[PDB]
Scaffold this motif. Structure first.
Motif, PDB file in Angstrom:
ATOM      1  N   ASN A 105     -43.204 -15.465  -5.189  1.00 49.63           N
ATOM      2  CA  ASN A 105     -44.019 -16.476  -4.161  1.00 49.63           C
ATOM      3  C   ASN A 105     -44.384 -15.524  -2.917  1.00 49.63           C
ATOM      4  OD1 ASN A 105     -41.781 -19.263  -4.829  1.00 49.63           O
ATOM      5  ND2 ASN A 105     -43.406 -18.326  -6.047  1.00 49.63           N
TER       6      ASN A 105
ATOM      7  N   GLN B 233     -38.156 -16.531  -6.137  1.00 47.07           N
ATOM      8  CA  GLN B 233     -38.689 -16.609  -4.932  1.00 47.07           C
ATOM      9  C   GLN B 233     -39.236 -15.390  -4.180  1.00 47.07           C
ATOM     10  OE1 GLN B 233     -35.406 -17.895  -2.454  1.00 47.07           O
ATOM     11  NE2 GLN B 233     -36.455 -18.212  -0.413  1.00 47.07           N
TER      12      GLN B 233
ATOM     13  N   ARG C 258     -51.249 -12.900  -4.561  1.00 52.26           N
ATOM     14  CA  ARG C 258     -49.929 -13.119  -5.371  1.00 52.26           C
ATOM     15  C   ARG C 258     -50.172 -13.404  -6.698  1.00 52.26           C
ATOM     16  NH1 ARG C 258     -49.313 -16.791  -0.868  1.00 52.26           N
ATOM     17  NH2 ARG C 258     -47.922 -15.769   0.635  1.00 52.26           N
TER      18      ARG C 258
END
Ligand SMILES: [Mg+2]
Ligand SMILES: [Mg+2]
Ligand SMILES: [Mg+2]
Ligand SMILES: [Mg+2]
Ligand SMILES: [Mg+2]
Ligand SMILES: [Mg+2]
Ligand SMILES: [Mg+2]
Ligand SMILES: [Mg+2]
Ligand SMILES: [Mg+2]
Ligand SMILES: [Mg+2]
Ligand SMILES: [Mg+2]
Ligand SMILES: [Mg+2]
Ligand SMILES: [Mg+2]
Ligand SMILES: [Mg+2]
Ligand SMILES: [Mg+2]
Ligand SMILES: [Mg+2]
Ligand SMILES: [Mg+2]
Ligand SMILES: [Mg+2]
Ligand SMILES: [Mg+2]
Ligand SMILES: [Mg+2]
Ligand SMILES: [Mg+2]
Ligand SMILES: [Mg+2]
Ligand SMILES: [Mg+2]
Ligand SMILES: [Mg+2]
Ligand SMILES: [Mg+2]
Ligand SMILES: [Mg+2]
Ligand SMILES: [Mg+2]
Ligand SMILES: [Mg+2]
Ligand SMILES: [Mg+2]
Ligand SMILES: [Mg+2]
Ligand SMILES: [Mg+2]
Ligand SMILES: [Mg+2]
Ligand SMILES: [Mg+2]
Ligand SMILES: [Mg+2]
Ligand SMILES: [Mg+2]
Ligand SMILES: [Mg+2]
Ligand SMILES: [Mg+2]
Ligand SMILES: [Mg+2]
Ligand SMILES: [Mg+2]
Ligand SMILES: [Mg+2]
Ligand SMILES: [Mg+2]
Ligand SMILES: [Mg+2]
Ligand SMILES: [Mg+2]
Ligand SMILES: [Mg+2]
Ligand SMILES: [Mg+2]
Ligand SMILES: [Mg+2]
Ligand SMILES: [Mg+2]
Ligand SMILES: [Mg+2]
Ligand SMILES: [Mg+2]
Ligand SMILES: [Mg+2]
Ligand SMILES: [Mg+2]
Ligand SMILES: [Mg+2]
Ligand SMILES: [Mg+2]
Ligand SMILES: [Mg+2]
Ligand SMILES: [Mg+2]
Ligand SMILES: [Mg+2]
Ligand SMILES: [Mg+2]
Ligand SMILES: [Mg+2]
Ligand SMILES: [Mg+2]
Length: 349
Positions: free
Chosen positions: A230, A227, A220
């Motif tokens: 993530n 969103q 990540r």
RNA sequence: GGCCGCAAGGUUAAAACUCAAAUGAAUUGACGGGGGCCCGCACAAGCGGUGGAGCAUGUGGUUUAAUUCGAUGCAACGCGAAGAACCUUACCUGGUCUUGACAUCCACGGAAGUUUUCAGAGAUGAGAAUGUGCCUUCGGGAACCGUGAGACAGGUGCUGCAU
RNA sequence: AGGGCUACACACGUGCUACAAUGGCGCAUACAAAGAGAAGCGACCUCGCGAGAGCAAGCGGACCUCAUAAAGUGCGUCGUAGUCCGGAUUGGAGUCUGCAACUCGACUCCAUGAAGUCGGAAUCGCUAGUAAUCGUGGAUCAGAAUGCCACGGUGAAUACGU
RNA sequence: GCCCGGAUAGCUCAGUCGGUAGAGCAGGGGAUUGAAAAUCCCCGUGUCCUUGGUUCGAUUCCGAGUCCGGGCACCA
RNA sequence: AAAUUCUAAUA
RNA sequence: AGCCAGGAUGUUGGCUUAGAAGCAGCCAUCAUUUAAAGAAAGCGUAAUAGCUCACUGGUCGAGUCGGCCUGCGCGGAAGAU
RNA sequence: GCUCAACGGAUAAAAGGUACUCCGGGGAUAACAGGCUGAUACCGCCCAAGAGUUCAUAUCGACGGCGGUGUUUGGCACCUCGAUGUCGGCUCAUCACAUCCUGGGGCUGAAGUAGGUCCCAAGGGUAUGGCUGUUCGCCAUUUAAAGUGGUACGCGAGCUGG
């Protein structure tokens, strides 16, 4: 098959000499020596035998010299010619048991200033004439002019056959003592020039980005993305196992673009790594053979007042300075080799 | 480091290291885009040229087996050279000689010369006739030729910054 | 003995000849000084278009030879053209010296007929029988000067000044 | 990844509107200088990035490419 | 009106 | 296919080198004796050496060795209550 | 008489911000998770030029070929917009085997001690800290070992809120 019979005659002694030495069981205790005998072949035996043959023949040649009142001219000449011929044959057969590519020649000014530049021009002209009367080629890579006369610094490349093995001995300091052309009075002046001779190496390059020695980590990113950021693996890190170089990219939203640009950055970052090392090795070599042009460290001296040229490595003095300056310097380099390879006869252990 | 100042800074005040000198006044020159007084085809006033063209000649560079050596600011460059086809010639290729092309010394055999032929690019080598006399105590010495040995001759080799 | 010092993409110095009418050409015709000569200077005559050849007097010279000065003057022609200007280069045929003119001599005859139309930045010599211009001789030397050293003819312009 | 511009002498740069390319510095030779700069005179420039096409003819006009500079790459 | 420089071995 | 025997002659070759001698790789592969044996197919060695195999004899003594076209099955085949 | 070219031409005449926002609607249409697929990803196998002194297969495998899985990045837009709470940590787990340790074997270029690779095996076990919100990672010191994955990339009507 012009001279294959000599090879067979050499074959016809070690064809059975080798047997008692392969299994003598004195040169096998260490691992290296057995395969050294197997691969490095039969150097010690035949070379020692040929040395003994040379010694016997040279002992033969020395005799029969104290005689007069007889025409001793042509037989003495042929005996000494055979002496020199066998000497050279054993010399090569014992030196061999190469490096004869193109060369780079650099000359630059030492103590003296303008006089050093003028002597650099003269010295370069000498080397150019020597190369020219050999069907070689000279190409000027770089030149830095010396306001009054010649070159502060000249780099040229000499192309031909067996160039390096002749000019590798000129590297060092050259001292010139003469009345300079840039000098109002009539004073003798001593100045110096510095010469470097380099072999020409292959310059291959390999893109060492073989995927079999990379490691790629996917994970990540960090920061503000909402969103979608993530729950996604959009960040790449590539580490190179041999060289231990790690590059991380998370600059774009796409994993594929990140992987591509980080791979390119890794390639550039690894290529600079060996470019720097090659540069530093070359610079160290140059500084080591070049010297500080200081008239105290030198390989030879040219005295124009007395028309003399002397080589300090072999302690030789000739009074043929102007022939030297006209590119006929072979007489200064042929004896040097004889001294140099005079070590090779001892270097056998 | 202390004291003083808003600051700029002022005042007090070292050491390591380094050189064999740094300095003052006066003397003789030289130099000045310092000042006076003069001279020279040095400027000015004129006349004719050179730099452009073709050729002669010397030099640098480049080439070559060699392109022999030296002069190379004015004060070198139609200069040494008041004269390179051979010679000159000192340079290059090749062929030849070793007390020797040019001198004195010692010994040995020989008047010196003059005509030839053969081979070779020539140097040179081989042979044949030709004359062997001159001042000389008939001791010969002596002009001049070949051979033999060394004291030597030979060098336009280097240094004009040893003369 | 032969070759080289005479080489040749190039650059510099010193000179010679020109670019024309104050001239080129043709004919006729006046006026010098200085010097050399015996293995030398060589007349007259004959032959040759000419360079020269043959024969052969005189002279160790104020006597013989080199050896007729030229620019100059008179007449004619050319009429501003790369020409009747210029004479480089090349082809053919010869003469002389020398043992020997291929590399590498000088000169004569026939043919040819290049650059060049007064020369950029720069730079040189000359103050009077001088600069400018026209011829003549000598040393060196078998032969081989546009160089060097000497001799005469014609003959200027200009110097307010520092 | 998308859009815009550029590629011209040894180096920095002008210019074509389809037949013809320039400037400063640099470079070569010669002057001046005892000599080196500064100064003065004379002289040479390039297959106009690569490739395909249209055209009698392309540095120029029209497609693709390479390299270089710029702007954007957001909402989660 | 202009106008820069001259290394390092004779003392 | 078994079971016994032979399974040879100058090539330590010149060819690449000390070695390639049948057996790492570079040309060639004749000839002799023989019922037969390849200037070597394999193993094994540093060259070696050796052990096999081709080929031919001997007992046994009945079938035996490979390809082609097709039907059905075998392996290749590991995931999260 | 209109590049009314947005070319059946809205007016003669017209650009933006909203994270301070509001309403009517949509799973007709995106972001999380499920679904289909599998280019990408990860895991196997086939041929054998070569490397490994000799020797393709102890260990690697060039140029090429054939599959599996459903962990990554994607493609599609089938469920949900009258609401399916989204990273890391804590507590508590459960399953697969493509096995990290322990167990059993084959081959080794396996003397022994230690290794390399493959086949069988899911019973039990499988660190603490420094840095950072970190997953990931680097570092210090241990351990027989510090496995790889699925479960709304398990777990907020169980806690937290960097
Ligand atoms: Mg945002
Ligand atoms: Mg203080
Ligand atoms: Mg203040
Ligand atoms: Mg003082
Ligand atoms: Mg004083
Ligand atoms: Mg004064
Ligand atoms: Mg004065
Ligand atoms: Mg004047
Ligand atoms: Mg001229
Ligand atoms: Mg000379
Ligand atoms: Mg001198
Ligand atoms: Mg003169
Ligand atoms: Mg001569
Ligand atoms: Mg003197
Ligand atoms: Mg001197
Ligand atoms: Mg003197
Ligand atoms: Mg001679
Ligand atoms: Mg000369
Ligand atoms: Mg007289
Ligand atoms: Mg005219
Ligand atoms: Mg004419
Ligand atoms: Mg005429
Ligand atoms: Mg004529
Ligand atoms: Mg005067
Ligand atoms: Mg006169
Ligand atoms: Mg110049
Ligand atoms: Mg000034
Ligand atoms: Mg300076
Ligand atoms: Mg000084
Ligand atoms: Mg099956
Ligand atoms: Mg099947
Ligand atoms: Mg299940
Ligand atoms: Mg519309
Ligand atoms: Mg419409
Ligand atoms: Mg329509
Ligand atoms: Mg989805
Ligand atoms: Mg191999
Ligand atoms: Mg899934
Ligand atoms: Mg949907
Ligand atoms: Mg859609
Ligand atoms: Mg839908
Ligand atoms: Mg649809
Ligand atoms: Mg659903
Ligand atoms: Mg609903
Ligand atoms: Mg919804
Ligand atoms: Mg509901
Ligand atoms: Mg299950
Ligand atoms: Mg298993
Ligand atoms: Mg296990
Ligand atoms: Mg095992
Ligand atoms: Mg289990
Ligand atoms: Mg378990
Ligand atoms: Mg279990
Ligand atoms: Mg179970
Ligand atoms: Mg049990
Ligand atoms: Mg999880
Ligand atoms: Mg979750
Ligand atoms: Mg719930
Ligand atoms: Mg917060």
């Amino acid at each position: 098959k012009p001279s294959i019979v000599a090879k067979l005659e050499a074959l016809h002694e070690r064809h059975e000499e080798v047997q008692a030495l392969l299994g003598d069981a004195q040169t096998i205790a260490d691992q290296e020596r057995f395969r050294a005998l197997s691969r490095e072949y039969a150097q010690l035996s035949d070379v020692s035998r040929c040395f003994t043959d040379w010694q016997q023949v040279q002992e033969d040649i020395e005799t029969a010299q104290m005689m007069l009142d007889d025409p001793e001219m042509r037989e003495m000449a042929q005996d000494e010619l055979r002496e020199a011929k066998e000497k050279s044959e054993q010399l090569e057969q014992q030196l061999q048991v190469d490096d004869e590519r193109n060369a780079f020649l650099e000359v630059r000014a030492g103590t003296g200033g303008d006089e050093a530049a003028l002597f650099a021009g003269d010295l370069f002209r000498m080397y150019s004439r020597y190369a020219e009367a050999r069907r070689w080629r000279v190409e000027i890579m770089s030149a830095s002019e010396g306001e009054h006369g010649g070159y502060k610094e000249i780099i040229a490349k000499i192309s031909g056959d067996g160039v390096y093995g002749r000019l590798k001995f000129e590297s060092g300091g050259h001292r010139v003592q003469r009345v300079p052309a840039t000098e109002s009075q009539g004073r003798i002046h001593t100045s110096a020039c510095t010469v470097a001779v380099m072999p020409e190496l292959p310059d291959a390059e390999l893109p060492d980005i073989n995927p079999a020695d990379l490691r790629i980590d996917t994970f990540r990113s960090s920061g503000a993305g909402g969103q979608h950021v993530n729950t996604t693996d959009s960040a790449i890190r590539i580490t190179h196992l041999p060289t231990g170089i790690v590059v991380e990219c998370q600059d774009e939203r796409s994993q594929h673009k990140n992987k591509a640009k980080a791979l390119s950055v890794l390639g550039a970052r690894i290529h600079a790594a060996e470019m720097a090392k090659r540069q530093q090795a070359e610079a160290s070599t140059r500084r080591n053979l070049l010297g500080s042009g200081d008239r105290s460290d030198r390989n030879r001296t040219y005295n124009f007042p007395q028309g003399r040229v002397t080589d300090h490595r072999i302690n030789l003095t000739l009074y043929r300075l102007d022939e030297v300056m006209e590119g006929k310097l072979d007489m200064l380099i042929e004896p040097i080799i004889q001294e140099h390879q005079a070590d090779q006869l001892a270097a056998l252990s």
